[model samples]
Structures are given as C-alpha cells and as structure tokens.
Target: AEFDRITNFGDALSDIGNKHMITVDMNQATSGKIGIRADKPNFDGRFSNGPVWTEYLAGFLAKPAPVRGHGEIDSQVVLKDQAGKQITYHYHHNALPGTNWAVGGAMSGLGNFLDIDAANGFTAKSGLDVLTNTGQQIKLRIANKGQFTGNELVSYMSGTNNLWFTLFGDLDQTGNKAAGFALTDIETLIDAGAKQVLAANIPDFVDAPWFAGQQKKTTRFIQSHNQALKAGLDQLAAAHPDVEIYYFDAFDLFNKVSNEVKTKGKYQDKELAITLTNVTGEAYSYATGKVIAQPNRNLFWDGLHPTTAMHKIMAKEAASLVISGRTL
Candidate 1:
C-alpha cells in the first residue's frame, strides 16, 4: 500500500512517470519505479550504447569535442559543417530502425496517426540546417491514393546528403510477417530510403541478449536480411560512387558474445565491463547494493543494453571501420 502510494506520487511528478503509469499494468500491482534506473551512472536516464559508438567515430572525424546525443531523445546527429556551423540532422525515426531507411518522406505516408512529428515537422534535416518537408505531403497523398505507392519514396532522398543510419532491427521486431505490408515491399522502401542518405540495414532483435533463448531462429532471420541488405547496398554503391555508405555488423558481434555467454554461463571476454564508480570511486551494484566481482563477466547490464565493456568492444570495431574506410 505504501509502495503504491509512493508510485502514484512519483507518477504525478513527471512525464516519465506518467508514461510509466501507462506502460505498466496497474491492475497487476506494480511499482512504476521498480524497473526504472539509470542505464549509465551519470546520466540519470536509460540509454543505449549508440552514442558510445558515435564517439568512437567522432575521434576519426577530427573533432575536438566529439558529437554526442541519445538515440531515444532526438536520435539526432549534431556536428559542425565545413564552415564551422553546428548542424543538427534530424532522422525522423522512432521505434523502427528500418524507418531510417524509409523513403517517400519519413514513413508519414504509412498513415500512423500517432506520428505527430511527421505531420508537423521536417522529416529530414541536412548539415546546412535545411529541412526536407516531405512527410506531410506524402501523408496527404497516401490519404488520397488509399495506399502508399512505392514510388512515393522517390522524393524523400532526392537531394539529401552527409546522412548515415541503420534501419533493420526495429523493422525485424515486427516479426517475419509484416502484417499488411510485405517484407520485400518494406525492404524495397528501405533500399529507396538508403538512396537518400547516401545508408544501411539491421539485425534481428531476437539475437539480443534479452531474447537469449531464441538465438537460432533470430540468427537465420538476420542472415537472410543481411544478405538482401548487402546486395542492395552493393547496387546502391555501384550506382553512386560519389556517395559514401557504411554498415556495422552489430548482429554478429552481439550474437557471438551472446552465444559465448549462454554456452559458458558467463561472458568469455576478459576485458573490464565497466569501471564506473560512485563519488568515492568504489565499484558497486546500483540495484543489489553489493560489491561486483569481475563485472565484465556479464554480457548485458539488464538483458538488452550491453555492459559498458561490451559497448567498448562495439565502439572499437565501429571506429576501426570508420578509420579504415570499410563496410560490414
């Protein structure tokens, strides 16, 4: 009873709490704050390690202060242009990473009423602070046409540049059957979306540590999707030699580490997972209030996000690719 009252108090205090109230089932007797904890120690927010990877890429970009942002907040890339002007590139995407590969104006044409940003804002932003106003028009056209014609993706990437992103993971979350939309149709759409960014594919979510029990099925799906994505990427590169594109093999990396963990009952890597400390510098578990022995033995912090050590490995791999000018 006290916990419920406290949970209600927390929920009433902020938007995050309100969102938590909605996501958690109240009837089941839940603590809205139970699962909520900082993903990283300093942030006080849950975050993926994507920013860490970008930081690695930034070192190669010759930036004094590396560009940094959260994948959930804006999922934006803020960087200085050649003229030293700060540019924020908005990738009108959420939930589905494949939406990053969406063509024809930001998937706004997909008729999702929940996407208010697509209805009112720029679908894509360039380094020059130029906004591509494609979403609204595409939505209207889709309304009139009764469905999205694959050609509608044509203008989405027509004049965009210096854009890079990945799109398959979230799309794969939809499962093997894409309901009303065909997988090929979306893949084709993603291919069209890639043409705009000068861009990429995704991994199977089932391969994530959270879904450790279903590795085989997910790996199979990932392999097929990667093959198709690679083929399209090759065609895109051949057709546009002046355009730069890259793919990071997040799937294989996560898969290999995950396999090692399930088989060995712990991470096989010897690298330190994270050395983050409290104000006094002693390492401890935020949840358990206990001293950790070999934190790197854990592959995931909470089943989904990688431990800081794993993030470091991914960052190094991605950074090497960027510095070496290679693709996955």
Candidate 2:
C-alpha cells in the first residue's frame, strides 16, 4: 500500500496506473557511469575488469549503431540488420527503462524479443574514452534476437557498431536493424559464413512431454540422431568439436506438429512440410502442411512455438528420414 502510494498517480494517470507509461525511443547506449564503477574502483573497494570496458567502448563507437528511435517516446526498436548480422546496443547510466523493460536491447524481429543482458543482472556499456583508456572490449555479441527483450529495464551502457546497422522507416524516422533477415536466416547466415553457429534455442526439455518421456532430450537427440544426426554432429564436431548444438525450437516444432497430425488421424512427412513451407507453400495442403508449418502462428500453440497437435506429423517425417539413414 505504501509503495503504491509513493508511486501514486495523478487523476489522469490514476486509471493508467495499471497501464504502460513513458517509452525511451533510442535503443539504449553505454554511459560513462557504469564504466567508472568497473574501470575506476571507488575507495570503498571496486574496480572494473579493463578488458570489459575496452570491448564496451568499441561496440559503442562502431559506426551507425543499430539504434532505432520510434514508438511512443521513440523507443520501439529493431537492432539487427538485414543480413542477420548481430547488433551490439549499448545502454548508459541516466537512461531510465520505463516500467517493465530492459536496459539493453537485441535485434530480434518484430515478434521475437529478447533480454539476455538483464538475466545476469549486468548492464552493457561502451565509450571512446573507455576504449582508449582500457583497451578491452568488455561486451561481445548481443544477438539482436531470440529468447527475451533486452533484460527488463536495467540502466547501463551497451556498445553497438554502426557499420552493420541498416536504417529503415524513411528519413523522417529510422531505426538500425540487421536488414533482410528472417528466422531461417540464422542457418543461411551460417552456410554463407557470415556468422558461426553455436548454441541455439534449447527448449525446456525436462518439461516438454515428448522430450521428458524419452530419456533425456540431449541423450534422446543423440540416440534419435545416433546414426543420422550423429553423422552430422560428428562431421561438425570434427572441425568444431567445441560447437554447442542448441535445441532449436524447430526440432521441437517438428515433433509437436507430427504428434498433432497423428492424433488427428492424419500424417505427413516433416521434410515435406519443410519443403512446402520453404519451397512451394502449397503442396502439402490441409492438415499436414499447414499444421506443421504454422503451428504457433495458427491454432497450434504459443504464437512462436508449435502445439502438441503438431507433434505427430513432424515425428513421422523424421522417422522416415532416420529410416533413409542419409549421411551429410
């Protein structure tokens, strides 16, 4: 009660108390303040790892920082570019993340928002002074997409390079984003050597039924792909043994789509679904194609992930692939 009173709103904002207020349009940037704490430890006993400060500054000073200032107060953002290149957005001190929001922002598309920076309770920052003084790039890559929307409203500096930023929304209004990028672009980017693949979209396997019922998801993944995926994994591992193959949602989506179709007394191959979705988009019409392809989008499940109804169709398709035992 006291807390609410302190935050008490005027008559106009009273009704809006439960509603959203203020928005900072500029994608966050690194402030000298956080740098000070990290770089110059106070007499009370504090010091920043110089390398951290160096990287932050580099990202901040990068040309055309992937920052799009729009929406109310100009804050709706899209940081990644069309090429699926990552954007490094810096957050600085003095910037307030209005209401429930994060300090750092990633470039996930319109629908996909992420906040990895906030998860660790750390803010990102970069500055020229810091770079010249520290000589270390503190922050690395802020994958402009996936998972969460830049950690819920924490204040700090985050550095992003402008060279990779692509401006959109006409001259009057513009935001920096990795241009012409789609979710599948992640794989495409890897194939093109634009970016290296690592861990991606590991589902909550322990909770998901399909994964839980089957030993462990990773173990199951290994066993299921033992012959097939193993070959791919082995090949990939040969060159990049340390590669982290994350449990992408697509794997789960394929399973979910398959199960749903099977339960409905209709089944189609998963690859066919992918082909239809990727190739033609009309071949595998009706249950198989649509369900597997647009699970979360339609009536499948969450807006992003597919539902159980989709599991059957995708599973059979995978089973067929395993049977074929194709080596990559």
Candidate 3:
C-alpha cells in the first residue's frame, strides 16, 4: 500500500458539497440571488452531474470515501452593513476537511472579504456570497493537522473563479497571484511531513459554451495562469528533492480532451479513458430550462463544470501521477 489517504484543496472543481450546502441555505434566505438550481440534477452536493474526480481518485487508491464537512462546520448569516454589503453569509467551515476542503468560490465572492466570525475563523468563506477561503483552507490544514502521514497524497487546484470575476482587469497579475498562493500553501504541506503532494494547474474553460464569446480574450490569461503554476511547481519540486511532488497539468488535459471531441478516440480507448461530446455546449442549462442531452457524452455539465465522465478521466490522470509519479 503506497498511499493511505488523500486530502483535497481547491474550488468548485474539487468541492463535493461544501458550497452546495451554503447555496441551499443562502438561496432560501435571498430568493436565489446566490444561485444553485436544486432541480438541476447534480448528484449529492457535487457541481458535476455525478461524483467528482476526488471521489474517483479515492476509489482508485482503494480508500474509503471522504466525509463531507458541510454539516460539521456551520455557516454564519449576516444582515448588516459590512464589506460594502448589507446581507452576507460566511461559512464557518474551519473543520479539518479530514478528506476534502474544496469550496465553491475559490478566488472571488459577492463582495465581503472580512470573516466576521472571529471565533471560528477569519479567512473562512463559503459557497455563493463568501467564496472559497483559500487563506483558511491552507492555514487550517497546516495548523490542525500537526503532521501528515508519509504516504498520504495532498492535492490543490483553484483560482478559476478569480479569473471569472476579474475578466477585464489585470489578468497576468491574477495568474501570478493565484500561482503564488498555491505555491505558498504547497510549501506548508511539505513542511508538515507530507512526502507526496500534487497541485493541478487551472483548467481553461475556453471551450465552455457560456464562455464562448470571450474565449478569444480569456485564452491568453488561462494559459498564462497555467504557465505561472507550472513554473512555480518546477522550482518547488527541485528544492524538495525528497518529496515526490507532481504537478497535474489540467490545462493540457482540457486542451487534449477538446481536440479529441472532434477527432475522437485518443483518450477514449486509452488507460485513462474518456468519451467527451458537446465540447462547445452545456449539457444542462438553466436558461434553456432543460438537461440538454446525455451528460456523460458531454464535456460540460453546465457553465464551467465538467461532467462526471470528465471527472473520472481527471481522477485517472491524478491517480497515475500519485502512483507512478507521471500522468499517463
């Protein structure tokens, strides 16, 4: 047994339910301002049409399913003037994710950055209004878990939301900032006796249906962000020669999968197999008011999220990296 368990960190992509739970509660309070269509047919609290890559990774590693910390950590609701908003809610989600610590809004939020709930945490952010508190996700993990077992694999992926919110603003800065944050967090993991750590670069949604119009502009920034991440990881890997640090090239995978949709059968029949269709359109749409088509055949479930089929492929890639120290 080379691995004992996995600890996840990231945004909507990595989250199983932390954000979904917050949105369910917040939407009830604000009448869908935050946004999560319960009728949308997402399995459990995942953003995907089925279980996410983390779940599949755990399964491949022969480990038990991770316990979602939605219920354990509470969300705080505020109806006052704070952070330029009158009504805002923050997820008091500082619980040791034990397994998964992904939040929905990783980089941006409805507005508020201050975590008023000082007792629980300051950097804690939730789903819609709060966003994924990257600060707390890393800080708490290192603070609470004094020492990581030598065999556990810790992974991270986030900052896609940041690009979304700041689409027109300084993008290269966003890339560097995001990469800097990821690198900082990873260094801490290494310090905590973590022998194996995997940090995935952000996947480009240039092929996403909703992101159709802006793809031309967004393309450069997406790759720039990935470049910063890859370069940063390279330096980190060199310093920590003892640690088996693997950088999951999610950007490369997305591009390859998109290309395969037209040609078909590269990844489709390979070890880490994938059968992706509708690479340009959403499989589910609140606008169209329907589940488009066979979700498994589609690349996107909705907006920027991928279908479970894609998630499975990601797990295959991640598992390969963790096990063999390379992504097949």
Candidate 4:
C-alpha cells in the first residue's frame, strides 16, 4: 500500500528520481496551538494598539522579501514496512490561503475615540469616523463613573472576568477593530479606549441601553448569560448531582436601577441605596431568585458599578451565604 503512489522528481539520478511523499505541520496560527494565533485577543482586560496577529504571521511566512519562487520548502516523511520498502509523503504550502484578518496597527484603535487623558496639549483631532468627540466632554463623563462604580474616576481600576463581562456584555467582542473600513476583522475594539483608561476597575455597563436605545438589553444580556451558565450547570449536575450551584444575578440588580441612575443624572442618593440593596441581596437571593427590595438612596456609587466599600460589603455577605447555605 505504501508503494502505490510515486511522482517524478526532476532529477532521476541515483535513488532520487522517484516522487516522494511528505508531511509537515507548520506551527502556524491555524494550528490552534501556541503563539498569538487567536482570531482576536482572548481576555477582556488586555489591550494593545498594534496588530499583534499580523506581526506574528509575517514573521513566520514572509522572509527574505523581494525574492520570488516557490518560496516554500518541501517535506518528506520516511517509513519502512516488514519487507523494508520505504514510503515518503511530501508537504508543500503556497501563500494561497492569504491572510484572514490582516488590517494593521494604524486603523485598529479607531474605536478608542476620546483619549481625553491625553499625555500633552496636542490631542488627536479625530478617530472612529462613526464617533464624534469634538463637543462631548460632558458625555464622556459617563465612562469616568462607569456602569460598575458610577464615579468620575476610572483610571485606577483593572478588569476582572466579571467586570469584563458586565461592561461589554458580550465576551466574544475580542478582535482587532478597524477604522476607515468595515468591522470585519477579529480584533476586539472595546477595551482600547475608555476601557483601557479606566485601567479595568469599574462595574457593570453604563452604555447598556444608552447607545443602543434598548433598555431591555440588560435583561437580554443577563438572561442569555444565565442560559449559558445554566447549560454548564446541567452538564455539571449530570456528572455530580451532589454539588451545589452558586451565583449572583448581578444583571437583575443592575437592570433594576440602571435606568433610574442613568436617566436621572443624579448618582449619589437613591441610586446608591438601590445598588447596596441589590448587591447586599445578591448572596441572599441566589437560592430563591428573589430580587431584594431596597430604596435607591445612594447604594450605587456610580451609575453602573459598585464602589470599593460596596464591593467589600458584597463580598462579606456573599461569603456568609456560601459558608452557611443561607442568604445573608
């Protein structure tokens, strides 16, 4: 069977004229292995202005530029059968597949529209043609507070998986964003601008329904996420029925008052109370799904997220529930 196929080698001299078969695996992005081969960035907090993927691929495939030819190396795998007959497999690659997501660094940061935290006097005039920041410093203030903490200072925080999910709602938003063109590339764009400046810390989503004009987007996002988590739970239950499930319906708590806070433009009083209520009850209601009732009297420090003190309170309450199997 191994000797069934053979091709003509240009040189028939010696034992070399017969066609040989070869197999080679390039440690390329397509392999789904090492390297920055992801279709886009993988985590929520990570941000970079350059096209990391393109740079990586170019370093691997294009070398000794301006030189043309096969530009490929042949590969051959050898093996022998009981009778000692040898088999060879050949491998070859052309630049045919082309590049999947190749737009470079220049246009990638377009979505990072307002870099008000500019290093100096000269600020970028424009970016992300879809957005306009010429007179929107007031609007930009929303990011300062963030959906999580609702404070005007966002540069000190970093993202947790929870915070990342809360901000973008869609974990799959990882990809290189392009300006001057379609959003076809796999690089996610949200983390580069306002997000990166916030340094990661923050809560919830401030723009959930504001930009999209869909107030229920929060509900949808939460429901969808719950579905996903539940699906995972079902699988886990099948494997281990004795195990327990624990989680916080932050979305429900977030959605309840996000409108009140986002709409009123007053974030200190009733809003904080509402936030504290929801967060305090997050652990208590996990088992019953009963949303806690609390007045919006300044519980949430920001329009969207909780403050550090609030975070501590939430942790303490939730910890008690985890240990005692009862809501605090």
Candidate 5:
C-alpha cells in the first residue's frame, strides 16, 4: 500500500511535466517511509513573460537575451508510511514547458528579471553569461503592481541598469501592514528598483467583476488605498532626482474599465461582463470544462490574474506613458 502511494505521487509529478526521476531513498520503505528525488517543474508560470509585454520590451533592444536553464532545480519530497518511517525523494528538471501567462516577475515587478539566480529569474547562463561577464548593459521591463509593495526594494537595486519597474496595484491582498504607511514613506521604498521607476497608482480591485458582488466595502477600501499610493508617488518625484520616476494613472485605466463594465456591461472591446463563478478557489467555466474564460471579455483569467487583453492594454498604455510622459 505504501509503495502504491509513493508510485502514485511520482505519477502526479509526472503528469505536471516533472517526469525525470533522479533518485529515491527507500531505506525506510520497509518501515513504511520513502524519499523521492526529481527535477524542477516545467509547468505553467515557471518563468512567464507574456507575448504583449515581451514584444514591447524587445522593441527597444537591438538583441534580446533569451532565458535559459530555467526550472533546473531538483525536487525533493519525503513521505512517511503507515509505520512512521520517513522516505525522501529527489528530482532533476529536464524539459522546458515554455512561457505561460504574464510570466516575468513574482508580481509584475522588474526585480526578478534583473537578478541572476538559480531560478533563472532572468536569462539563463548558456546565452547571456558572456554579455553580463563583459560588463555590457541590459534593458529590462518589469510589471508587478499587485505583488511588490515596496518592502523588497533594497534587494532589487544595484543589480542592473537601463531598468523599468511598473508600480504595484492598490489591492493590498498581501496584507502587509506597511502598505498603510504615508505615500512619502512608501516612496522611500523606491530607493533603487531602477534609474527609471513608473510609479503607477493601484487600480480599484473592488470594482473588478470578481469583487463587484461585494461592491460597497470593496469600493471604499480601494479608494482609500489608491489615494495613499498616489500621494507617495507625488512626493517620490522630488525626493529622487537621481532617478527618473514617471507616474502612470493605473487607477484611471482600471476605473474606466470598471465604469464601462458596470454601465455598458462589457469591456471597451465589446466583450461580455468579466464575471465568473468561483467553485472553491478555482474558476469554473461551463463552456470549457476548465478554469478559463473568453480572453477579451473576462477581466480575470482566474481568481486573481488578469487576461491577456488586460496585460496587452496596460503594456500599450505603459509604453505610451514612457514615450509621451502623459498619464491619460
């Protein structure tokens, strides 16, 4: 029975694209425990950089550095059998599943792209190592408004140059207490994400079709959160003259979408309402029998992520913001 469970666990990993089994310590197998070794996953979102944003970043560069050797880490798992013996398993990553949705940073932030680490957060060493070793400069575009709240700003700086950071959103879903601080205090967090920081205000998540059902409280929360974020960016301009900081009106972008959705009951592109039923935490689509919706119409791809259309529009506007310096 224990062997069956262990084999089934391996099957589960294999189903998700981690098929390489490196080693397994079954010393405790008789004692009802086992260990497994294998490779990192090649599943979705491993190192995601969507087509729209990826193409936009490529436009500014003469040569693009491709990501390599990503998902190379070994996967380790230990299991205890009915008899209480511990088993450990390890895996080595082999195949690359390729990019999935919105695949760049931990959020939409640029920090992950500029850093050179084991996760292949940026480019893999096989291709870009020579360029980095020779001290050549690289340009990076990052968008992480929903995930990065300013606490990890220090670790992001001093890594690369010709960098850009799209600011975090107003939906404080991370529940970081520091998120409530004054905008001035928040601006201090941007000491060095890059020489150019696009401090966009957070959008009204409360207005999104996901939370529209809970309208009243969500609206108030988003409004207050955005005001604080806006003030911080306003003060950031004067404080960091050494860095060129630009402000993008993300609130306006999302608000316009919200207003249109609420009144016209569709996205500006004429897609239907961006609403979905959440069965447990996953999106339930009657049409596909999976967790997906019509890309253009559905504001959210799932419970949290926005659709490709949303990312595309934001990338388009963000490019304009950089070129024209207008917040509209």
Candidate 6:
C-alpha cells in the first residue's frame, strides 16, 4: 500500500460529519440541514444517501472507513425534533476518527479551514462553534506528530460551495484568489509531512435544479475556477518535487456523468444507474419527510447534494486513478 492514512478536507458534498455533528452539539438537531440531519438512511450524517466517496475511497484502499463526529466529548446534545418537544441528541466526539477532518461549510472560501471561510475574516458563517481555520486543522493533525508514519493521502477540494452560495466579486478573480489561498493550505499540509494530495476542481453547477435559471453565470464561474485550479496545481507540483500533487478532474467526471444521465441512462456500471424520473425533483424531502421511490436513481437527493449513486461512481473512478499509480 502506498498510503497508511487518509486525511480529508472540504465542504457539503465531501462532508461525512463535523458540521452536522456540530449542529446536534448546538442543540439544533434536525432543524439545520446544511451539514445534514443524522437521521435514517443518512449513514451517520453523510450528506448523501449512503456513504460519501471517502468511505468507499477508504474501502478501496483496504483501510477502515473514516468515522464522523465533532467535539472531544461523547456527551448528549439536547434538542428538539420536527415536533415541538425537546430532545437530547448524542454528540460522540472523536478527537481523531482516523483523520477524517473534512468539516462542511455552506459557502466558504479557502483559509477558513472549515469555518465561515475567513475571506470575511473569522467572524464565522454561523452555528459550527468549533475553532475554524486551515492552520487549526493541520495543527490538530500535526499535534499527533508522535503517531506520524508520513504515509498518508490528503484531499483538498473547495471553492465550489463559495461559488454556489456567495459572490466573491469577479468570477475569474474569485477563482484565482481561491487558488492563492488554496496553495497556502496545500503548503501547510506538505510542510506537515503530507506527501500525497488530491486537489479537485469544481463541477459546473448550471445543471443543478437550484441554478437552472442562472446557467450562463454558473458556467462562466466554474470555467474560470477550474481554469485557475489546474494552473495552480501545475505550479504547486513543479515546486514540490517530493509531494505527489494530484488534480482529480471532478469537473470532467461530473460532466461525463451528467451527459450519460440523458443518454446512457446510467453510469458505466449498472450499480450506478441514474434515471431522470425526478431530474427536476428530488428524492427525499427534509421539509415534508417524504422519500421518493428508488431514491438512488435520482441524480440528486435534494437541491444541491448529489445522491450516493453519483458519489459511488466518483469513488470508483478516484480509486482507479490512485490505485493504478500506486501498483504492486
């Protein structure tokens, strides 16, 4: 095996907990769904239907799946359900869940670690009361220096959320500045002995139901972001000889699958079949508590998050990308 551990970092689409657990810890429970609700079929706060890509990624690497949780205490976070009654929610905090540190941010840029994306500078996005910063995450992991084997895989994927939710002035400038701060985050990880890094580009969100009306703007934004993303990674790789800086072309993959959904009716694999019965609609409704039939076939679970079906295909492709490079 080329890697002994995998440390993840990103937002909503890549999150397995942290933010959702933070919600429960804040006594919000089912009230807030940005991070996701830890309810039935969520697989313990995964934003998707089943496990997220990281879960499958770990399995493909012959490693145990990374667990999800927030704080340091395994205490109860009391809150209310959809009903008007109060309830106690459990916040099982793992100081380290095998280095699953990818906290979910709604619309954060780089340098915010997983908080409110301090491009606004540290006032915070709201609700995730934890200390938030990229340095803080690296420090948290580096603090466990005694446990370092220096054989770990790290993933850094961001900027998609910020583009989808907020305006960072010009689209091109927003993406370039993102690359700047992202490079800083990457340097921090490499300095802390992170050897392998997968920095992903953003997918074009013009097709997402929420952004249907604003397709032209969304397309321009993602195009600009991906353009800068590759340029930055290329530069970073040239500078860091020892570190393996990988650019997972998530944009291309997502685009390929998006096209396939309209033509082939499924991904290359039968297990990853995607039907368009609910293309304009969603499978599960957090507001109404209704789950559509064959939720997996739906490309998206809700307005923004892709279903596990999509996440599964992503995991398979990612595993192949890294696996072939690693070899026996």
Highest TM-score: give the candidate number: 3
The model with the greatest lDDT is 3
lDDT of 3 by residue, 1-328 (tens): 6577788877778888867665565556555444453235777778888988989989888877766542234545544333534455554544544668677666521122321221111222343235446545655566566578787877777768657656644334556666676677677778778788878888868877766778875687677777877887788888888888888888888888888776764347356455565677788885675786577877788888888889988888887777775621
lDDT (Cα, 0-100) at 173 in candidate 2 = 13
**Candidate 5 C-alpha lDDT tens digits along 252-294:** 8766766666676655532322242221132323234464333
Write down the TM-score of every candidate: 0.42, 0.21, 0.80, 0.28, 0.47, 0.76
- Residue-level lDDT of model 4, residues 1-328, one tens digit each, is 1111111000001011001110112223113111121112211111121112112222222321111111123333233344555443343444211111111111212231211111112222222111111111112222332221211111111112222333444433221111111111101112212111111111244342221443354434434434444344345335443333333333344454455555754333332232332322122122343322332233332223233333333333333333444211
**Which parts of model 4 are misplaced by more than 4 Å?**
1-118, 121-212, 240-245, 252-297, 326-328
Pick by lDDT: 3 or 5, better one: 3
Q: Which residue pairs in candidate 1 have backbone atoms (N, alpha carbon, C) closer than 3 angstroms, thus clashing?
A: 97-167, 98-167, 104-153, 273-309
Worst lDDT run of 10 residues, candidate 4, spans 8-17
Stretches of candidate 5 off by over 4 Å are: 1-85, 88-190, 207-221, 269-293, 326-328
Runs in model 1 with CA error above 4 Å?
1-42, 46-51, 64-209, 255-297
**Model 5, residue 247: displacement in angstroms?**
2.3
Clashing pairs in 6: 113-134, 118-121
**lDDT of every predicted structure (CA atoms):** 0.32, 0.23, 0.68, 0.24, 0.32, 0.62
Residue ranges of candidate 2 with Cα displaced over 4 Å: 1-198, 201-236, 242-249, 252-262, 265-328
